[PDB]
């Protein structure tokens, strides 16, 4: 049984990457793994989050997929979002109990990620959701030091709080 | 040397990996944001006893030479040491060796996981190129 669970897992992580909704949803309802890790440590959600499917996101976590699951690097699904833009998929993972400043093997938490791809939206919703201005990665780096770096004069003043 | 995001772009773009074998620069970018974070002196252990060096995370068996790795082909015939400068150039010319010959960047697991399908473009943007 756990056999076809992790079996249904993989088919998951496919299905989760390609944008496959129907398919998603059947896996899920045939017994599939909602926590199915790849070769990477990627969950559907990670996968999902990724590619900025919103949907399958939304019943990966009615079907209790792990929102803090951590990847081999220890990016969060939250991670992930914030690096692409995807504001929708970074409100529901906060909804769903995301962890605002869950940190990866460089220390680096969501803001961080947000902040250096110069995706202002997300960065005021991490802000609402308790994001830390002062948190510092493996390197010294605030999220306000990677606007500076970068030259974003837009960012360097929302981050002034 | 750990390179900012556009600091990185700015440098990859003049050593002309900007659309080299048909990866735009966002794709180098991107691959080195997940391999290396940006490090050029990140250094990783692998499961089959070889180690990968540098921003571009090059491998011990086949790329490079670190002489404590066993079946060492040493493809990019370069000391593995010799990527862990804060000059890219050692570690651009041996990914132009790896992209030329085979599947792209592929060669990339980061990349792979990561960068490949998504909009790569986002790499470079708020850069001054």
Same mark, same amino acid.
């Given at each position: 049984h756990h056999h076809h669970g992790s079996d249904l897992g993989k088919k998951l992580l496919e299905a989760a990457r390609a944008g496959q909704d129907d398919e998603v949803r059947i896996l899920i309802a045939n017994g599939?793994?909602?926590n199915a890790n790849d070769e990477y440590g990627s969950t559907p959600l990670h996968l999902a989050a990724l590619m900025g499917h919103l949907e399958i996101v939304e019943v990966l976590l009615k079907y209790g997929?792990?929102?803090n699951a951590v990847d081999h690097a220890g990016h969060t699904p939250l991670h992930l979002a914030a690096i692409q833009g995807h504001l929708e998929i970074v409100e529901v993972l906060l909804k769903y109990?995301?962890?605002?400043?869950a940190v990866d093997h460089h220390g680096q938490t969501p803001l961080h990620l947000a902040a250096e791809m110069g995706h202002l939206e997300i960065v005021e919703v991490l802000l609402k959701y308790g994001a830390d201005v002062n948190a510092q990665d493996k390197?010294?780096?605030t999220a306000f030091d990677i606007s500076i770096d970068n030259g974003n004069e837009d960012l360097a003043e929302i981050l002034q709080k | 040397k750990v390179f900012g995001r556009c600091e990185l772009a700015a440098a990859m773009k003049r050593h002309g990996?900007?659309?080299?074998?048909?990866?735009?620069l966002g794709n180098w970018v991107c691959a080195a944001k997940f391999e290396?974070?940006?490090?050029?002196?990140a250094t990783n252990r692998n499961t089959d006893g070889s180690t990968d060096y540098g921003i571009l995370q090059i491998?011990?068996?086949?790329?490079?030479? *670190? &002489?404590?790795?066993?079946?060492?082909?040493?493809l990019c015939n370069?000391? /593995?040491?010799?990527?862990?400068?804060?000059?890219?150039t050692a570690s651009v010319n041996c990914a132009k060796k790896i992209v030329s *010959? &085979?599947?792209?960047?592929?060669?990339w697991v980061a990349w792979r996981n990561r /960068?490949?399908?998504?909009?790569?473009?986002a790499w470079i943007r708020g850069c001054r190129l």
């Amino acid at each position: 049984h756990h056999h076809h669970g992790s079996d249904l897992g993989k088919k998951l992580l496919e299905a989760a990457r390609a944008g496959q909704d129907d398919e998603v949803r059947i896996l899920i309802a045939n017994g599939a793994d909602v926590n199915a890790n790849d070769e990477y440590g990627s969950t559907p959600l990670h996968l999902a989050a990724l590619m900025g499917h919103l949907e399958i996101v939304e019943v990966l976590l009615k079907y209790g997929a792990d929102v803090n699951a951590v990847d081999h690097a220890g990016h969060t699904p939250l991670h992930l979002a914030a690096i692409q833009g995807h504001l929708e998929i970074v409100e529901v993972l906060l909804k769903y109990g995301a962890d605002v400043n869950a940190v990866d093997h460089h220390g680096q938490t969501p803001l961080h990620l947000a902040a250096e791809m110069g995706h202002l939206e997300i960065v005021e919703v991490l802000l609402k959701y308790g994001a830390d201005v002062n948190a510092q990665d493996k390197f010294g780096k605030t999220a306000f030091d990677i606007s500076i770096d970068n030259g974003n004069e837009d960012l360097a003043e929302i981050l002034q709080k | 040397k750990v390179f900012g995001r556009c600091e990185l772009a700015a440098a990859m773009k003049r050593h002309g990996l900007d659309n080299y074998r048909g990866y735009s620069l966002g794709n180098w970018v991107c691959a080195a944001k997940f391999e290396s974070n940006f490090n050029t002196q990140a250094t990783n252990r692998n499961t089959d006893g070889s180690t990968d060096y540098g921003i571009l995370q090059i491998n011990s068996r086949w790329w490079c030479n *670190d &002489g404590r790795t066993p079946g060492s082909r040493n493809l990019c015939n370069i000391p /593995c040491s010799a990527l862990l400068s804060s000059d890219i150039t050692a570690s651009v010319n041996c990914a132009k060796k790896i992209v030329s *010959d &085979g599947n792209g960047m592929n060669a990339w697991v980061a990349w792979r996981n990561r /960068c490949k399908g998504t909009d790569v473009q986002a790499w470079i943007r708020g850069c001054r190129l």
